[PDB]
């Protein structure tokens, strides 16, 4: 239920955001943490180590995806000088 | 007329012709003429291989038809009660 | 190898020769046009040979080749009486259409000849295929070449014309395809000798009729679905126009004899009044607008619409004479519209560069040979006896009258109005004063080329107008098979 | 094999900084994929609905192995664009088989062949391409919710990296940023759907989810609403990645912004993997008995997306003037057909689906190859057009405007005909392979009662045909605005070619002109084969159509 | 029977709710600092137009079923015909009122006649091999079955046609059919 | 002007302009009370009238071998 509210917060990041693409990455990270939080609590309720293992791979993949996205943003900033959409 | 070997020998010849046309290169200069027996030869190979795929595909489809009828028959005999 | 495959193969050979002869000899374009013309002559010679061997009273398809190598889409070729005359019309028209453009195609001559040769193969395949889905494949195959032919060789408005004919035909055809696919699913194939034995249930027939009819009314065309023709038949090059009006309009007519009469008999009989109201409306509306059309080629194009309404009403008559008259009119229209397009799009247009009627008057004074053939052609368009046009109009009109009298009576008014626009257009061009004062130069009369394509077309309409048995004798037995009904003391014999 | 090639290529790439090695590394990636085809070809001598592998985390089917090979073959074909220089010098005195295999030609090639072009100097490009392929093969073979997520990220992340690998282009870096940002949103929906499956079912196994669904399809305490609702969220993330409407907006920008050679791989590879993976998931969740579950079936999202992709794909394409944006909207329209065949789950629709995907991939491939080849053919042409002079990243995307193809039929007629044949196949004009593809999907949809969708499909096809006809009108109906370069053939500008034997002894010299520069054979041959497959399909259809018939019969085998 | 007013209100709510959602996106996508109350000031007509159409659709189809005392596809046609007219009413042009009505009426009636697979299909749940088999070789039918649907005349004269026509002609014109003989010797 | 060289014609600009107006007149059609009434009369009313008359008289009459003592009416 906390995980649901957190997923909303990450969802609302896109709704409340016209010009801040850095907030777009952060909203994706909140959603990923919210979904991982939900898996972890469910696997504690169902006594299943596989759920914890699933969480660990999401953390790894989320970390690897943040690395790629920050890299792509740097290749974008080098030619532009702004991370701001003129809206 | 759909003879596989002759058709795919012809297909290879048409590939070389279209390629020469796309390249805007002459269709027949003597020192290049070996390419048509080559493209046609590769085409003939592709079609001997398609021949044997067809033989396997036909057998597989013939077995499948029998299984469907056999399945249909037993179900019909089951409903006889 | 079957003679029917030879028919489809000869034009492809000529396409190959045209596209490769630059490597064995700057080759003159005369050589290219000689190859294409001889290619069409040989195709005509083969069709004549087939007809000499053809038997007039066989209900088995003739000159077929056994396959024994069944695939998902196999081209089966066969001929009977209801298709043999369309094959002959295609192989006679194609050489004349080539000669009619011998001088007026000045750029891209290789592309023009290859398109026309490919058109010959595709149109012939439409008449010869023995499968209903094969019919759609050949019917639709002619669109890209037709799109390119109009766009590479058409007049000023060629882009709008090319788009119209492509999108109209495609849209109608997509409703025919859905009808064909439903048939293929119920029966398991669209091969003629299997589907013709199927008996679709009445509600299925009704929704099958709609979808096949939508396509055939777009292709007839019926009035209101005919702006593609008023554009494409006018903007097309002359050879394109001859092929488009002589053979391409005939596809929907031959299509009725394969796709509606044997397999949708109950829907066809129950809906004939809707067909007849549309055909009756088309006969009057097209006739009145032809009378007010000021583009000479558009006027000949609009009269095709009025004539096609009569063969469409004859094909739904469910009587022997109406069905034979429909085929007779289709053929007679092919010779007459070819000649009138040559007279307008090839003789007037080449000399003046304009197609507006206001600039022509009194051409008889300086062009007596043109006015003689133009007049005979205008009598054919009016369905004057001694032309095959009278025989087809009379038989078509009699069958339409006997099937539904009020529809035939309205359709009969064409005898008054086809005369009106034919005689009006003849009088304004050949007669109607001295030679037009808009002509600065004098005009030469018909060249030998123009004379001998008009003379040949005029010869066919008159010879068949006097002895129409040359087509009817090979029509009677096969056309019996598409009639629906029974006599009480003749049926169910024991 | 694909994992060994990636690691071995990475190790060789790691210790090199030489950019002249890029063409060689690309050619090795072709050899590596040919071995991958060989191993998967040997893995097709059994009949099964599926064999679980590696502790049940992966699986193999005949369908899985066929589309493994197909992905490899499309990837070898795309890899040619980075393995051969676009133009060659050909003369009739170096054309014999003894000349090609024993003699050599010497001339200054650097400017002619574009030796130092951008697509020839990215060392890691074939390697990143292999990573995407691994993501795609693994996703086809995934038997497990965690395996699904890992596979889809692996393929997606490589696609983002591919869209940005031209780091010196502002257009490319922008498109890579857009792909990653909205693709990250879609991955969250996939992870959310997979997570809701797990927290409700207690299993990560696809087998176990299908068993629970099978028992729950009987005709109250734990009624299984979650399965359809989870897969609905799950499917939306996959609808984004195939760029189905209404989740389509990203692809016309991204496909236009990234370089055209990259677009060829990016626009083709991902749809094959996601659609194949969706096929099995659609089959095994299909509620046979009409129960409450069927009322909320997640597969209606596929059918709505199909409807919306038919309309958006054709209507929006009407006013596109940039050639790559038109291809993006053309794909969305064709995705509508693919989605219709997948949504109707029948033997006929699955056959139609399998055939449609493979013919569409080879056709969209022919369009990209012709577009690239035309762009590389303007080397010896000049234009004074003011519009063309203001185009951005001209080197990355030489053809960006439909107007650039004006009069191209007068520049190269047979290559223009190949483009026209490919486009007419997209319309569905018989007897091209595209017509037979559309015909099969319509048949199945009508036979299963999808009439309303059948009618919207035919109406949208006429609208779609308009912008297809508009490309063809541009190529054929007008004179070109490109003229041959005066200096390339100026009667006094000859470059020298030396012909030498195996002993490096000069045999003859020859003077050469711009008229002796041609499209390289790999591109002409590939266009020629595919163009003739599209054209002559009616004579070749038996084995190709029979393969799909057998595959579906196995998948449906009761 | 059904309550046309009550059902129409639900129709307005479902599609007005969707219109209100699209109103919120327009407000969110506004460039100027207009505020949260732009939902009913600028984009408010959009939500109202949607509520008006779907309400009209649900009212007129429900009314059409009540008037005809039947539940068939036609009612979805008039419902769409009225909903399309309401769509065109906002533009203020009579041709757009009719044309928009026609499209909505045709599309919605066509979907209902064929049963669009938007939410499920009419599952046969029968032997499809037997269905296609029966339709395939139903080559010859009882003649009466055909006569029941095309009738007699127009070239369809089964044995005994003349006797029935004789009977038919007497019942209408009161005339006995006695054709004359062409032979004087009889 | 159109491929082959044609003869010199005194192309009258007024007549040419009239010909251009006829080719482009479709671009300027509008729905008015007059045009809608005419279009409805030609497309709906008259065809539906012929359709209704053809419907109501379909099968009404047959002439074949009708003698005195018989009726043309069949229905
Ligand atoms: C449907 C499917 C079935 C269709 C079948 C129909 C027939 C198709 C025939 C295709 C034949 C292709 C071909 O051999 O091209 C001749 C082609 C002739 O082109 P050209 O323009 O006259 O001369 C080259 C130019 O001067 C300068 O040329 P370039 O430098 O521009 O290009 C060099 C060379 C490519 O570079 C090569 O050296 C090719 C390497 C191929 C290796 C194959 C064997 C591998 C194992 C080795 C042991 O070009 C190609 O051969 C293009 C290959 C494209 C293939 C695409 C196939 C999918 C589409 O290449 C040659 O020079 C011939 C010598 C080498 C032949 C290859 C080996 C023998 C054939 C093996 C086939 C497989 C068994
Ligand atoms: C416009 C040309 C249609 C193209 C040809 C259609 C090909 C046949 C489809 C006609 C169709 C829907 C028609 C819906 C309205 C059509 C569109 C409305 C106007 C569009 C702007 C008839 O569907 C009807 O078929 C009747 C039985 O024949 C049933 O009685 C009806 O209940 C049923 O609705 C679908 O049924 C078809 O599927 C097969 C299954 O094996 C049925 O056996 C047949 O039924 C067959 O026909
Ligand atoms: C323009 C040409 C038309 C298109 C031709 C393709 C259709 C015909 C080939 C379809 C194809 C693979 C398709 C891969 C391409 C993917 C998509 C293709 C792109 C389509 C444009 C389906 O073959 C598989 O089909 C599956 C169902 O369809 C079956 O299930 C499989 O069991 C079957 O193997 C044929 O594969 C075949 O490879 C050959 C090995 O030489 C196999 O022969 C034998 O195998 C072993 C004993 O068997 C022996 O050890 C081997 O010595 C022997 O040789 C065949 O057995 C078969 O494996
Ligand atoms: C059952 C059938 C009943 C049909 C009842 C309505 C009859 C409508 C028939 C539609 C089929 C033919 C449409 C022809 C449209 C061609 C055209 O407008 O000109 C193309 C024009 C030619 O017009 P142009 O030559 O005069 O000027 C334009 C100049 N260029 C081409 C350079 C721009 O070429 C184009 O490509 C521009 C078209 C832009 C998009 C227009 C698309 C309209 C297509 C509608 C099809 C929708 C079908 C849905 C039903
Ligand atoms: C399109 C058709 C693709 C067919 C692929 C194929 O030929 O694989 C079968 C073949 C199977 O080979 P093979 O191992 O069966 O060779 C014959 C084996 N004996 C001698 C025992 C009969 O795979 C290949 O050889 C091609 C591999 C390279 C693929 C390069 C394509 C680019
Ligand atoms: C496509 C790019 C080019 C092909 C890349 C190599 C193909 C990779 C897959 C593969 O190896 O299968 C082909 C096949 C794999 O084997 P195979 O079983 O498919 O083919 C038959 C094998 N023999 C000959 C034993 C019956 O490779 C070969 O057969 C090549 C044999 C000749 C070796 C090279 C020439 C000799 C050079 C001497 C030095
Ligand atoms: C084949 C059967 C015979 C067909 C040819 C018979 C006619 C003939 O003899 O050819 C004469 C024809 C004209 O003579 P020619 O000297 O070429 O005039 C052009 C000079 N510049 O010379 C030709 O150019 C004819 C070229 C052959 C055309 C044959 C077309 C065949 C296509 C289907 C096979
Ligand atoms: C089936 C048989 C093959 C189909 C037809 C393909 C014909 C290709 C062979 C022609 C090769 C050729 O060299 O054509 C060259 C010609 C223009 O080139 P050129 O004459 O050199 O230009 C001189 C400029 N001074 O270019 C041409 O002549 C091509 C003319 C256009 C091709 C026909 C029009 C397109 C028809 C639709 C094509 C797509 C659908 C295919 C239809 C096939 C039938 C269904
Ligand atoms: C079946 C398809 C039904 C037609 C769908 C399209 C009709 C439509 O949406 O309305 C458009 C049209 C409005 O025409 P109008 O605005 O007067 O033209 C101005 C041009 N500048 O509306 C119309 O003209 C249609 C009016 C006649 C409708 C009779 C049915």
UniProtKB/TrEMBL annotation, chain A:
It catalyses: a ubiquinone + NADH + 5 H(+)(in) = a ubiquinol + NAD(+) + 4 H(+)(out). It is a multi-pass membrane protein. Keywords: Electron transport, Membrane, Mitochondrion, Mitochondrion inner membrane, NAD, Respiratory chain, Translocase, Transmembrane, Transmembrane helix, Transport, Ubiquinone. It holds the Pfam family Oxidored_q2. One of its GO terms (biological process) is ATP synthesis coupled electron transport. Its EC number is 7.1.1.2. GO terms for molecular function: NADH dehydrogenase (ubiquinone) activity; oxidoreductase activity, acting on NAD(P)H. One of its GO terms (cellular component) is NADH dehydrogenase complex. The chain crosses the membrane at residues 20-42, 54-79. Signal peptide: none annotated. It is found in: Mitochondrion inner membrane; Mitochondrion membrane. Core subunit of the mitochondrial membrane respiratory chain NADH dehydrogenase (Complex I) which catalyzes electron transfer from NADH through the respiratory chain, using ubiquinone as an electron acceptor. Core subunit of the mitochondrial membrane respiratory chain NADH dehydrogenase (Complex I) that is believed to belong to the minimal assembly required for catalysis. Complex I functions in the transfer of electrons from NADH to the respiratory chain. The immediate electron acceptor for the enzyme is believed to be ubiquinone. Belongs to the complex I subunit 4L family. This is NADH-ubiquinone oxidoreductase chain 4L.
UniProtKB/TrEMBL annotation, chain B:
Keywords: Membrane, Transmembrane, Transmembrane helix. The chain crosses the membrane at residues 33-50. This is Uncharacterized protein.
UniProtKB/TrEMBL annotation, chain C:
It holds the Pfam family Proton_antipo_M. GO terms for cellular component: mitochondrial membrane. InterPro entries: NADH_Q_OxRdtase_chainM/4 (IPR010227), NADH_UbQ_OxRdtase (IPR003918), ND/Mrp_TM (IPR001750). The chain crosses the membrane at residues 6-25, 35-54, 74-99, 111-129, 135-153, 165-187, 207-230, 242-261, 267-287, 299-320, 326-349, 369-392, 404-424, 451-470. It is a multi-pass membrane protein. One of its GO terms (molecular function) is NADH dehydrogenase activity. Keywords: Electron transport, Membrane, Mitochondrion, NAD, Respiratory chain, Transmembrane, Transmembrane helix, Transport, Ubiquinone. It is found in: Membrane; Mitochondrion membrane. It catalyses: a ubiquinone + NADH + 5 H(+)(in) = a ubiquinol + NAD(+) + 4 H(+)(out). Its EC number is 7.1.1.2. It comes from the Eukaryota. Residues 131-417 form the NADH:quinone oxidoreductase/Mrp antiporter transmembrane domain. GO terms for biological process: ATP synthesis coupled electron transport; electron transport coupled proton transport. The keyword Nucleus does not apply. Core subunit of the mitochondrial membrane respiratory chain NADH dehydrogenase (Complex I) which catalyzes electron transfer from NADH through the respiratory chain, using ubiquinone as an electron acceptor. Essential for the catalytic activity and assembly of complex I. Core subunit of the mitochondrial membrane respiratory chain NADH dehydrogenase (Complex I) that is believed to belong to the minimal assembly required for catalysis. Complex I functions in the transfer of electrons from NADH to the respiratory chain. The immediate electron acceptor for the enzyme is believed to be ubiquinone.
TrEMBL record, chain D:
It is a multi-pass membrane protein. Keywords: Membrane, Mitochondrion, Transmembrane, Transmembrane helix. Residues 143-464 form the NADH:quinone oxidoreductase/Mrp antiporter transmembrane domain. Belongs to the complex I subunit 2 family. GO terms for molecular function: NADH dehydrogenase (ubiquinone) activity. HAMAP family: NDH1_NuoN_1 (MF_00445). This is NADH-ubiquinone oxidoreductase chain 2. The chain crosses the membrane at residues 28-47, 67-85, 122-140, 178-199, 225-242, 254-278, 298-319, 326-347, 353-382, 414-437, 449-469, 517-539. One of its GO terms (cellular component) is membrane. It comes from Chaetomium thermophilum (strain DSM 1495 / CBS 144.50 / IMI 039719). It is found in: Membrane. It is an enzyme of class 7 (translocase). It comes from the Eukaryota. Pfam families: Proton_antipo_M (PF00361). InterPro entries: NADH-Q_OxRdtase_suN/2, ND/Mrp_TM. GO terms for biological process: ATP synthesis coupled electron transport. It catalyses: a ubiquinone + NADH + 5 H(+)(in) = a ubiquinol + NAD(+) + 4 H(+)(out). Its EC number is 7.1.1.2.
């Amino acid at each position: 239920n906390i995980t649901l509210i957190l997923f909303l917060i990450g969802i609302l990041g896109f709704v409340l955001n016209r010009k801040n693409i850095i907030l777009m990455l952060i909203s994706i990270e909140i959603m990923l943490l919210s979904i991982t939080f939900l898996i972890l609590l469910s696997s504690l309720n169902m006594d299943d180590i596989i759920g914890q293992t699933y969480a660990i791979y999401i953390i790894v993949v989320a970390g690897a995806e943040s690395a790629i996205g920050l890299g792509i943003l740097v290749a974008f900033y080098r030619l532009r000088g702004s991370i701001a959409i003129e809206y | 007329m759909v003879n596989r070997i002759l058709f795919w020998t012809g297909f290879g010849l048409a590939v070389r012709f279209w390629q020469l046309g796309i390249e805007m290169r002459p269709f027949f200069n003597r020192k290049s003429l070996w390419a048509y027996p080559l493209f046609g030869g590769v085409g003939a190979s592709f079609g001997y291989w398609l021949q044997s795929i067809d033989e396997k595909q036909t057998k597989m489809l013939e077995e499948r038809k029998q299984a469907i009828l056999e399945k249909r028959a037993r179900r019909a005999q089951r409903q006889a009660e | 190898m079957s003679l029917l495959y030879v028919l489809l193969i000869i034009p492809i050979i000529g396409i190959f020769l045209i596209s490769t002869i630059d490597s064995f000899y700057f080759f003159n374009v005369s050589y290219y046009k000689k190859i294409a013309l001889i290619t069409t002559i040989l195709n005509l010679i083969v069709s004549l040979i087939i007809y000499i061997l053809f038997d007039f009273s066989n209900n088995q398809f003739q000159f077929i080749q056994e396959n024994l190598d069944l695939s998902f889409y196999d081209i089966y070729l066969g001929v009977d009486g209801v298709s043999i005359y369309f094959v002959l019309l295609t192989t006679i028209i194609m050489p004349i259409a080539l000669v009619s453009n011998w001088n007026s195609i000045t750029n891209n001559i290789k592309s023009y000849l290859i398109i026309m040769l490919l058109l010959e193969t595709l149109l012939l395949a439409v008449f010869l295929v023995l499968d209903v889905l094969l019919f759609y494949i050949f019917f639709e195959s002619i669109l890209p070449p037709l799109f390119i032919l109009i766009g590479l060789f058409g007049s000023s408005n060629k882009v709008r014309a090319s788009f119209y004919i492509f999108l109209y035909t495609l849209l109608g055809s997509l409703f025919l395809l859905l009808s064909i696919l439903t048939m293929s699913s119920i029966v398991g194939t669209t091969y003629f000798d299997v589907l013709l034995k199927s008996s679709f249930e009445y509600t299925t027939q009704l929704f099958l009729f709609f979808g096949i009819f939508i396509a055939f009314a777009v292709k007839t065309p019926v009035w209101g679905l005919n702006s593609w023709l008023l554009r494409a038949h006018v903007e097309s090059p002359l050879g394109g126009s001859i092929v488009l009006a002589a053979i391409v309009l005939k596809l929907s007519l031959y299509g009725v004899f394969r796709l509606i009469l044997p397999i949708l008999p109950q829907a066809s009989l129950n809906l004939t009044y809707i067909v007849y109201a549309i055909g009756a409306i088309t006969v009057l509306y097209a006739s009145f607008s032809t009378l007010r059309t000021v583009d000479v080629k558009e006027l000949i194009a609009y009269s095709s619409v009025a004539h096609a309404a009569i063969y469409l009403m004859g094909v739904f008559s469910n009587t022997i004479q109406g069905l034979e008259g429909a085929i007779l009119l289709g053929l007679a229209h092919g010779f007459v519209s070819s000649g009138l397009f040559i007279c307008a799009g090839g003789i007037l247009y080449d000399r003046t560069g304009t197609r507006l009627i206001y600039f022509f008057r009194g051409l008889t004074q300086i062009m007596p040979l043109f006015s003689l053939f133009f007049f005979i052609l205008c009598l054919g368009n009016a369905g004057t006896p001694l032309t095959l046009n009278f025989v087809g109009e009379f038989m078509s009109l009699y069958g339409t009258l006997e099937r539904l009298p009020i529809a035939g009576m309205l359709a009969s008014t064409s005898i008054i109005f086809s005369a009106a626009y034919s005689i009006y257009m003849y009088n304004r061009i050949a007669f109607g004063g001295s030679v037009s004062l808009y002509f600065i130069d004098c005009f030469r009369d018909l060249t030998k080329r123009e004379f001998f394509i008009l003379f040949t077309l005029v010869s066919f309409t008159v010879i068949l107008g006097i002895y129409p048995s040359f087509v009817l004798d090979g029509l009677h037995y096969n056309i019996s098979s598409v009639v629906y009904g029974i006599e009480p003391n003749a049926s169910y014999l024991t | 094999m694909i994992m060994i090639s990636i690691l071995s290529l990475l190790l060789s790439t790691s210790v090199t900084l030489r950019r002249d090695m890029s063409i060689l590394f690309n050619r090795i990636s072709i050899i590596a994929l040919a071995y991958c085809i060989l191993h998967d070809t040997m893995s097709l001598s059994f009949i099964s609905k599926g064999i679980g592998l590696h502790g049940g985390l992966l699986h193999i089917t005949n369908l899985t192995q066929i589309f493994h090979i197909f992905i490899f073959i499309i990837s070898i074909l795309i890899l040619q664009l980075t393995s051969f220089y676009p133009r060659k010098v050909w003369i009739p005195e170096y054309s014999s088989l003894k000349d090609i295999f024993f003699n050599k030609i010497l001339y200054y090639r650097t400017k002619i062949i574009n030796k130092m072009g951008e697509h020839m100097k990215i060392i890691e490009y074939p390697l990143i391409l292999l990573f995407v392929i691994s993501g795609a093969v693994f996703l086809i073979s995934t038997n497990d919710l965690v395996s699904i997520f890992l596979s889809i990220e692996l393929q997606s992340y490589g696609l983002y990296l591919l869209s940005t690998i031209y780091r010196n282009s502002e257009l490319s870096t922008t498109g890579g940023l857009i792909y990653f940002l909205l693709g990250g949103l879609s991955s969250c929906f996939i992870l959310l759907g997979t997570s809701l499956l797990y927290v409700n079912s207690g299993t990560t196994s696809l087998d176990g989810l299908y068993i629970l669904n099978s028992i729950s399809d009987v005709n109250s305490w734990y009624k299984p609403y979650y399965l359809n609702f989870s897969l609905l969220i799950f499917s939306i993330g996959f609808l984004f990645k195939v760029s189905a409407a209404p989740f389509h907006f990203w692809s016309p920008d991204v496909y236009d912004a990234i370089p055209t050679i990259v677009t060829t791989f990016v626009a083709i590879i991902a749809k094959i993997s996601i659609f194949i993976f969706l096929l099995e998931l659609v089959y095994y969740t299909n509620s046979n008995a009409n129960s409450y579950l069927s009322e909320f079936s997640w597969t209606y999202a596929l059918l709505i997306s199909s409807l919306l992709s038919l309309i958006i794909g054709t209507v929006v394409g009407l006013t596109q003037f940039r050639i790559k944006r038109l291809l993006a909207y053309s794909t969305i329209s064709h995705v509508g057909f693919i989605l219709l065949a997948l949504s109707v789950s029948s033997i006929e629709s699955t056959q139609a689906f399998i055939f449609y995907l493979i013919q569409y991939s080879i056709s969209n491939l022919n369009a990209f190859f012709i577009l690239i080849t035309i762009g590389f053919s303007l080397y010896g042409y000049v234009t004074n057009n003011k519009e063309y002079k203001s185009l951005l990243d001209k080197n990355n995307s030489p053809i960006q405007l439909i107007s650039q193809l004006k009069g191209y039929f007068y520049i190269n007629p047979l290559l223009s005909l190949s483009l026209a044949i490919t486009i007419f196949s997209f319309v569905g004009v018989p007897p091209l392979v595209g017509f037979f593809a559309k015909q099969m999907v319509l048949s199945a949809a009508l036979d299963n009662g999808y009439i309303f969708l059948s009618l919207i499909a035919i109406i949208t096809s006429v609208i779609g045909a308009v912008y297809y006809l508009n490309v063809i009108k541009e190529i054929f109906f007008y004179s070109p605005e490109h003229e041959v370069n005066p200096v390339l053939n100026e009667s006094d500008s000859n470059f020298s070619l030396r012909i030498l034997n195996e002993k490096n002894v000069l045999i003859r010299s020859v003077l050469l002109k711009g008229r002796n520069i041609f499209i390289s054979s790999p591109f002409s041959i590939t266009i020629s084969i595919i163009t003739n497959v599209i054209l002559l399909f009616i004579f070749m259809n038996k084995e190709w159509l029979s393969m799909g018939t057998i595959l579906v019969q196995i998948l449906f085998s009761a | 029977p059904k309550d046309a007013v009550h059902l129409g209100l639900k129709g307005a709510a479902v599609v007005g709710g969707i219109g209100l959602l699209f109103a919120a996106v327009r407000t969110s996508l506004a460039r100027k600092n207009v505020g949260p109350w732009a939902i009913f000031t600028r984009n408010g007509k959009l939500a109202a137009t949607f509520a008006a159409v779907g309400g009209a659709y649900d009212f007129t189809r429900a009314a059409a079923a009540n008037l005809r005392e039947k539940e068939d596809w036609v009612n979805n046609g008039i419902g769409g015909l009225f909903a399309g007219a309401t769509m065109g009413l906002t533009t203020g042009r009579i041709p757009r009122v009719l044309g928009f009505a026609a499209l909505t009426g045709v599309v919605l009636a066509t979907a209902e006649y064929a049963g669009s697979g938007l939410r499920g299909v009419f599952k046969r749940d029968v032997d499809e091999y037997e269905r296609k088999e029966f339709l395939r070789k139903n080559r010859r039918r009882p003649i009466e079955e055909t006569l029941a649907e095309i009738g007699e005349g127009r070239g369809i004269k089964p044995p005994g046609y003349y006797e029935r026509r004789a009977q038919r002609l007497k019942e209408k014109y009161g005339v006995d059919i006695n054709p004359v003989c062409a032979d004087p010797d009889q | 002007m159109a491929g082959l060289q044609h003869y010199k014609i005194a192309m009258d600009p007024a007549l040419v302009r009239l010909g251009s107006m006829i080719s482009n007149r479709y671009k300027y059609f509008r729905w008015t009370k007059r045009t809608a009434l005419v279009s409805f009369m030609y497309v709906v009313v008259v065809p539906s009238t012929i359709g209704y008359l053809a419907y109501k008289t379909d099968g009404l009459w047959d002439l074949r071998a009708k003698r005195r003592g018989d009726l043309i009416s069949e229905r």
